[PDB]
């Protein structure tokens, strides 16, 4: 049936909740940024990434919250690959002048992710709670998150995550060599621009290896994904004013929503997050490049194709990173087989049954 | 067929095409406002009137327009009608509170828009010249137009003009009590609340004495007008998530785009502006208050019903100001018979041959 088309529209109805929430979050981040700049700290060269506009990105995917990245460039750097992650690395320097104060954050000859993030979080908590102009608080530092999560409850509880992000203009680490496989979908010209762009390192402590290493940083391809999320067609004009519409974002928002609503009532599903669905659909679009395969008069069949890919992913325990092939996101190290089978049941049960979890008048 | 549902779809997909300039103007005005209220001028106590946001499509230009109002609260104000117009006033002050900068703008006992406006422009160019150096214009000082006109100079060229408005927390003026007929549609209770919020004054020169008397202000209800736009239904669950959709704001956007198209092609239609349609749809909603009259399935009949109403307005030369019943926007002294007749022609011929002007996919 076309029940899905009506689910989209009940979701699409974010009037005065996504556009009026932007203006304020635009402000808080634009004010916090400018007060973080020119204020005597190592982060004076901090700048907002064009990480997906409020109303372009983070609108049809995870509405309850926002995220922004605060990038900061660094000079000549050495990446040491953390064991066999492909994603986790240790960041060192090349010379270390005193015309570069990021050094105040090295524990050893490695830039520490924790000394930087704690001082970053410090300066935010201290400059954010220094004005009584809007009701904006800082949530508890949750062990594991690389973020400073802004809690605001002016109309309702909103969450803005600030991810400090090292920017590197050098060559993309070699673990991403045969990743980003868009050559039969986005073309080789497009893939080549994308890789000339910088890459980013977020302070995500690797919970494995020696112990919870906080000095470890994780790669983050956020700028690139929004590119793929916005330029998703094999035809340049896809879902543009003078071109044809597809259901790629449709399927993704439904998958996002479906997984969102199950996670809400099954803490057994805490090990799955939206990035699993995102990387899932990236492999889907790499499989079916032609925008004919994503026609809005086959939303049902397109959505079902995705459901089946994700179930085969949860069964074969295989979820290789879109950019880092060697890093399997559904490793048994990362996710117990209990939660995969548990997820498979709920996704099966909803799918066999016209998705009763979507039933809201 | 129902080709207008498709024309609405092509404006939803033209709104995102401007989300950038929209955020451009948010950063430009918020930095401008902040710069205004951190310096010694008569407008240090200025605020942005929350006249909605750039999610404005129903109410004004789908392709090129951005309005903004700066509210400056004033003391006990003594409005004296400009003879009988209802809409035009002189602003008198008998008792000026010790400490009010609104003294320098006086002429005897009557506030000068002219002298205030000409200090409103100065204080701005001394802050948009030092507001770093963006690509937003600082346009021509114009006549009549109570604004410091600007426009987008980044991408294409969207327009953005800043209207100084006095805020008065007094009683709504005597000319506007028989106004706002929203008793059998929105309620007596909400009407009472809507007339207990301030009224605004924009500095609009008039057409009397000779013409352009250099001491008058016009009434402004853009705040209340916004409220009625977003609270248009008689059922409070209107257009909400847990309620039923209507086609009200849909019809408005169709009619405003129809008129802009025609306007964009004929000099003869220069007397007509977007606020003529708004007023016409406010009466249109007072006359048909039931929400089932505006079902999204009746869209063409609703749109044609409004088209027929607007024509009965043009041709009988009656379109009362919604908050000032005595001020006839389509009066004989305001729009001549030549123009109405012209307009009644291209509309009708634009209503019987389907919608040729709406033939740009
Ligand atoms: N805002 C944000 N938060 C991120 C994050 N990467 C991890 N986290 C959060 O930190 C905690 C540590 O968990 P772990 O077991 O992995 O050490 C967790 O609270 C984690 O939240 P979560 O993993 O369920 O994610 C919440 C939020 O972050 C997205 N996310 C998780 N993992 C990733 C990766 N590898 N790349 C890009 N985004 C990721 C989630 O989808 C969700 O939106 C981060 O980048 N940003
Ligand atoms: N933003 C704005 N601009 C206004 C305005 N009142 C007048 N104007 C513009 O100033 C010039 C003087 O013309 P007039 O013949 O009235 O002396 C004109 O260029 C006038 O513009 P326009 O009237 O053709 O339309 C421009 C713009 O402003 C809206 N608007 C016109 N009239 C009103 C009234 N009475 N109330 C609320 N909005 C009005 C138009 O729809 C359009 O967007 C003003 O109040 N604000
Ligand atoms: Zn598309
Ligand atoms: Zn409605």
Swiss-Prot record, chains A, B:
Where in the sequence is PolyADP-ribosyl glutamic acid found? Answer: 30
- Outcome of substituting residue 274 to D: Phospho-mimetic mutant; increased cyclic GMP-AMP synthase activity
Phosphoserine modified-residue sites: 53, 145, 274
Mind telling me which residues the site (Arginine-anchor) is annotated on? 95
- Binding positions for ATP? 53, 225, 256, 274-278
Quick one: effect of changing residue 98 to E? Slightly decreased tethering to chromatin. Does not affect interaction with nucleosomes
As annotated in the record, motif Nuclear export signal runs over 8-13
Residues noted as binding 2',3'-cGAMP in the record, renumbered to the chain: 67, 144, 161, 204, 218-220
Site of covalent link Glycyl lysine isopeptide (Lys-Gly) (interchain with G-Cter in SUMO): 71, 189, 226, 236, 318
Binding-site positions, GTP: 51, 161, 218-225
Domain of life of the source: Eukaryota
> Which keywords has UniProt assigned to this entry?
Acetylation, ADP-ribosylation, Antiviral defense, ATP-binding, Cell membrane, Chromosome, Cytoplasm, DNA damage, DNA repair, DNA-binding, GTP-binding, Immunity, Innate immunity, Isopeptide bond, Lipid-binding, Lipoprotein, Magnesium, Membrane, Metal-binding, Methylation, Nucleotide-binding, Nucleotidyltransferase, Nucleus, Palmitate, Phosphoprotein, Transferase, Ubl conjugation, Zinc
Q: How is the cofactor bound?
A: Binds 1 Mg(2+) per subunit. Is also active with Mn(2+). Mn(2+)-activated enzyme forms an inverted pppGp(2'-5')A intermediate, suggesting a non-canonical but accelerated 2',3'-cGAMP cyclization without substrate flip-over. Mn(2+) ions are coordinated by triphosphate moiety of the inverted substrate, independent of the catalytic triad residues.
Q: Which cofactors are reported in the record for this sequence?
A: Mg(2+); Mn(2+); Zn(2+)
What reaction does this catalyse?
GTP + ATP = 2',3'-cGAMP + 2 diphosphate; GTP + ATP = pppGp(2'-5')A + diphosphate; pppGp(2'-5')A = 2',3'-cGAMP + diphosphate
Q: Which residues carry this modification: 5-glutamyl polyglutamate?
A: 126
Any idea which residues bear 5-glutamyl glutamate here? 156
Modifications after synthesis and translation: The N-terminal disordered part (1-146) is phosphorylated by AURKB during the G2-M transition, blocking CGAS liquid phase separation and preventing activation. Phosphorylation at Tyr-55 by BLK promotes cytosolic retention. Localizes into the nucleus following dephosphorylation at Tyr-55. Phosphorylation at Ser-274 activates the nucleotidyltransferase activity. Dephosphorylation at Ser-274 by PPP6C impairs its ability to bind GTP, thereby inactivating it.
* GO cellular component terms attached to this protein's record: cytosol; nuclear body; nucleus; plasma membrane; site of double-strand break
Q: What is this protein called?
A: Cyclic GMP-AMP synthase
């Amino acid at each position: 049936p076309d029940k899905l088309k009506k689910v989209l529209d009940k979701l699409r109805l974010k009037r005065k909740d996504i556009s009026e929430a932007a203006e304020t979050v635009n402000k808080v981040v634009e004010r916090l940024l400018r007060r973080m700049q020119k204020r005597e700290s190592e982060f004076k060269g901090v700048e907002q990434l064009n990480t997906g506009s409020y109303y372009e990105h983070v609108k049809i995917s995870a509405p309850n919250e926002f995220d922004v990245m605060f990038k900061l460039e660094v000079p000549r750097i050495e990446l040491q690959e953390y064991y066999e992650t492909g994603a986790f690395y240790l960041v060192k320097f090349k010379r270390i002048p005193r015309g570069n104060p990021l050094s105040h954050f090295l524990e050893g000859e490695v830039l520490s992710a924790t000394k930087m993030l704690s001082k970053f979080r410090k300066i935010i908590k201290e400059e954010v709670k220094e004005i009584k102009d809007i009701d904006v608080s800082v949530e508890k530092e949750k062990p594991g998150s690389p973020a400073v999560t802004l809690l605001i409850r002016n109309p309702e509880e909103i969450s803005v995550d600030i991810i400090l992000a090292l920017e590197s203009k050098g060559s993309w680490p070699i673990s991403t060599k045969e990743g980003l496989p868009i050559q039969g979908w986005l073309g080789t010209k497009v893939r080549t621009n994308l890789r000339r762009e910088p890459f980013y390192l977020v302070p995500k402590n690797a919970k494995d290896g020696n112990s919870f290493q906080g000095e470890t940083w994780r790669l983050s391809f956020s700028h690139t994904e929004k590119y793929i999320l916005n330029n998703h067609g094999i035809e340049k004009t896809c879902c543009e004013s003078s071109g044809a519409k597809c259901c790629r974002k449709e399927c993704l928002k439904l998958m996002k929503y479906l997984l969102e609503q199950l996670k809400k009532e099954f803490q057994e599903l805490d090990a799955f997050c939206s990035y699993h669905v995102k990387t899932a659909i990236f492999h889907m679009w790499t499989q079916d490049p032609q925008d004919s395969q994503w026609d809005p008069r086959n939303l049902s069949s397109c959505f079902d194709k995705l459901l089946a890919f994700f179930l085969e992913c949860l069964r074969t325990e295989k979820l290789d990173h879109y950019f880092i092939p060697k890093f399997n996101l559904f490793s048994q190290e990362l996710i117990d087989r209990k939660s995969k089978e548990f997820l498979s049941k709920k996704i099966e049960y909803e799918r066999n049954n016209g998705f009763p979890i979507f039933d809201k008048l």
